[PDB]
RNA sequence: AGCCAGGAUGUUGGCUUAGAAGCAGCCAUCAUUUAAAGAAAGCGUAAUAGCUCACUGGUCGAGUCGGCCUGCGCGGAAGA
């Protein structure tokens, strides 16, 4: 997780999950990539 | 959709209508209930039909759900998905000892948890555990709690995994 | 023996170009090619003799070998 | 494999006083307090493990402190600091600035200071010649430390095993070691090699490093490929596997001459230094015969680069010797 | 959307490289089989292999997939 005011999927091993006001980009292959907010 | 407006239910399973409680009754499991908040129950007893109670736009969110939940009750009283709960790694207890199991990492306290019905087990092994089905939700929520007492650790992948396979040797490249 | 192999052996060069087909190193005769296509006919799941001929010609052309009697 | 050169920066100079003395009674004073900062230097630490990848991290090098000022309530400001650098698994230190090597090691828990500071801000007193009034300053000179250091592991991690297409390096290291092999990671501008841990039977353990990714032996011509083969040849210590069994497929006498000659050809100095020969496939030998041959080849070299033994057997002072080759590799040029 | 597959065959095309042969770099990227099957996307592998898959038939069986402009909302959002 990191502080980022831009959401867009990085690889297809990021998928965009919306938990309201925080939007993560964890995927099965790579939950390495992760965001906090959005 | 083609599932929130697209519906059978044999004779072994029967239903006790309420406004968005679907109470099922049947065999091998009965008296099962799960609620929504925006579906009318239409009776049919041949897969009951669903959609908005009064007109809502969250009522097909609830219709496809209520659909599958009904169907999950059907499968539930014919035993659901949880039927195992393995764990990768050796030298760690994981047999069934009555209602309690045990688990180790070299733990200086027993690690165990009792069994309610609907998830009863017994194995002859300390690696595999053979559980029982029941209502799909119920078994799944207790199934999670089991594995949660030592989630996977991935450098060799050891750590008590779920009913499904959720391990991967997703190491940090180090030993 | 592959078609790929067999046409390089018949053309007498064992190496390819640095850029195959945009550069050629040797050439391979349709007489060789027809017969290799017959041996490799067997190894094909083809329905006819022509089928094999095209498949083996296609292997020559891409390894930087000309296809010409 | 890669070798690296770090740029390390320490703290830096102040920023002089913006100050006036404030009174309700008396209108405005001068500056009290002043500048701030200064900054420490570069040091080095040497370590057995790694065992947290901070070299597959890398961000783009070593940064540190800018100075201070203060003003509320008549203030100066503090100092900057020293930066210290960690590697995966030992380093031998050189500095591009000296152009040469300082300390010689890959001896762990050995630290060395490459020392400078004396960075200062521009204060009100600097301008002064006992006439000046400069109440307002907020200003800095100086840049914090700059030096290019040069680190080399001694590589692939400290020692690089360079077989031949008869090799079997990992299996033998596991036989001779009750220690596990790790996958190591290093500060490489290339892929990051396979690490194998060696027992030094002293209640310390040392690691030996083998071919990029899966092994192939450098002599075969691939390290995992030409690219890898280029990563692999770089190690300062190179190791020569033979199968000192009656079998080697390319016979042991011949093999030993060809590997030893190629290393000589490349640099005679490498043969004459603490670069090793390691006798292997003694998982097919009891090591009394192996030991003799290991020892004859070694002595016949006519210089330092004698014999290492890998793959366990006997107790002819052999455990001591295994530990000794590793010690010799550690002591470094 | 999903599901069954074919998933073949010259073939795993070659240079480079021991192996880089759809998928490091460099270039080919042709052709066959059938109602269908790409010298093959990614993962994975030095690279292939494999693994799955845009490729394409069958299946469930009817509407469905993305652009363009637009109303009004949302996240972004820390102080004694």
Swiss-Prot record, chain A:
- InterPro entries given for it? Ribosomal_bL36, Ribosomal_bL36_sp
| Classification lineage | Bacteria, Pseudomonadati, Pseudomonadota, Gammaproteobacteria, Enterobacterales
- Known function: One of the last ribosomal proteins to be assembled in the 50S subunit, it contacts a number of helices in the 23S rRNA, acting as molecular glue. The simultaneous presence of uL16 and bL36 probably triggers ObgE's GTPase activity and eventual dissociation from the mature 50S ribosomal subunit.
Provide GO CC annotations from the record. Answer: cytoplasm; cytosolic large ribosomal subunit
Its recorded name reads: Large ribosomal subunit protein bL36A
Q: What does the subunit comment say?
A: Part of the 50S ribosomal subunit.
**Which NCBIfam families is this protein grouped with?**
rpmJ_bact
Give the species this sequence originates from: Escherichia coli (strain K12)
Q: Which UniProt keywords apply?
A: Ribonucleoprotein, Ribosomal protein, RNA-binding, rRNA-binding
GO BP terms in the entry: cytoplasmic translation; translation
User: Which one of the record's GO molecular function terms can you name?
Assistant: structural constituent of ribosome
Similarity field: Belongs to the bacterial ribosomal protein bL36 family.
From Swiss-Prot, chain B:
**Binding partners and assembly:** Part of the 50S ribosomal subunit.
State what protein this is by name: Large ribosomal subunit protein uL6
Gene3D superfamilies according to UniProt = Ribosomal protein L6, alpha-beta domain (3.90.930.12)
Give the UniProt keywords, A-Z.
Acetylation, Antibiotic resistance, Ribonucleoprotein, Ribosomal protein, RNA-binding, rRNA-binding
Q: Which InterPro entries match?
A: Ribosomal_uL6-like (IPR000702), Ribosomal_uL6-like_a/b-dom_sf (IPR036789), Ribosomal_uL6_a/b-dom (IPR020040), Ribosomal_uL6_bac-type (IPR019906), Ribosomal_uL6_CS (IPR002358)
Q: What does this protein do?
A: This protein binds directly to at least 2 domains of the 23S ribosomal RNA, thus is important in its secondary structure. It is located near the subunit interface in the base of the L7/L12 stalk, and near the tRNA binding site of the peptidyltransferase center.
Gene Ontology MF terms: large ribosomal subunit rRNA binding; structural constituent of ribosome
> In the record, which positions carry N6-acetyllysine?
42
Q: Does the keyword Lipid metabolism apply?
A: no
The gene it comes from is rplF
Q: Does the keyword Zinc-finger apply?
A: no
Protein family membership: Belongs to the universal ribosomal protein uL6 family.
| HAMAP family documented for this protein | Ribosomal_uL6_B (MF_01365_B)
Look up and give the organism this protein is from. Escherichia coli (strain K12)
Q: Name one GO cellular component term.
A: cytosol
Swiss-Prot record, chain C:
Residue(s) carrying N6-succinyllysine: 8
What part of the entire protein does this chain span? 74 to 142 of 142
Q: How does it assemble?
A: Part of the ribosomal stalk of the 50S ribosomal subunit. Interacts with L10 and the large rRNA to form the base of the stalk. L10 forms an elongated spine to which 2 L12 dimers bind in a sequential fashion forming a pentameric L10(L12)2(L12)2 complex.
What's the protein name? Large ribosomal subunit protein uL11
Q: Which family does it belong to?
A: Belongs to the universal ribosomal protein uL11 family.
Task: Tell me the organism's taxonomic lineage.
Answer: Bacteria, Pseudomonadati, Pseudomonadota, Gammaproteobacteria, Enterobacterales
Annotated signal peptide: none
Origin organism is Escherichia coli (strain K12)
- What this chain does, per the record? Forms part of the ribosomal stalk which helps the ribosome interact with GTP-bound translation factors.
Swiss-Prot record, chain D:
User: What does the record say about domains?
Assistant: The C-terminus (residues 341-390) is not required for either 50S ribosome subunit association nor 70S ribosome dissociation.
Recorded E.C. number(s)?
Answer: 3.6.5.-
Its encoding gene is what?
Answer: obgE
Q: Name one GO biological process term.
A: chromosome segregation
UniProt-listed InterPro entries: G_OBG, GTP-bd, GTP-bd_Obg/CgtA, GTP1-OBG_CS, GTP1_OBG_dom, GTP1_OBG_dom_sf, OBG_GTPase, P-loop_NTPase
**Known consequence of changing residue 311 to P?**
Severe growth defect at 42 degrees Celsius. Decreased levels of some ribosomal proteins, altered PTMs of others
Gene3D superfamilies given for it?
Answer: GTP1/OBG domain, P-loop containing nucleotide triphosphate hydrolases
User: Which compartments does it reside in?
Assistant: Cytoplasm
SUPFAM superfamilies of this UniProt entry?
A: Obg GTP-binding protein N-terminal domain (SSF82051), P-loop containing nucleoside triphosphate hydrolases (SSF52540)
CDD domains from the entry?
Answer: Obg
User: PROSITE patterns, alphabetically?
Assistant: G_OBG, GTP1_OBG, OBG
In the UniProt annotation, what is the result of changing residue 234 to C? Increased sensitivity to HU upon overexpression, supports normal growth, no effect in mazEF/relBE or tonB deletions
Domain G, chain residue ranges per copy: 159-281
- Regions of biased composition (Polar residues) lie at 126-142
Pfam (any one): GTP1_OBG
Record-stated family: Belongs to the TRAFAC class OBG-HflX-like GTPase superfamily. OBG GTPase family.
> What residue spans carry the region label Disordered?
124-144
The chain positions of domain OBG-type G read 157-330
Obg domain location, by residue? 1-156
The species this protein belongs to is Escherichia coli (strain K12)
Per UniProt, which keywords does this protein have? Cytoplasm, DNA-binding, GTP-binding, Hydrolase, Magnesium, Metal-binding, Nucleotide-binding, Ribosome biogenesis, RNA-binding, rRNA-binding
Name this polypeptide is given: GTPase ObgE/CgtA
Positions contributing to Mg(2+) binding = 170, 190
Q: Where does GTP bind?
A: 163-170, 188-192, 210-213, 280-283, 311-313
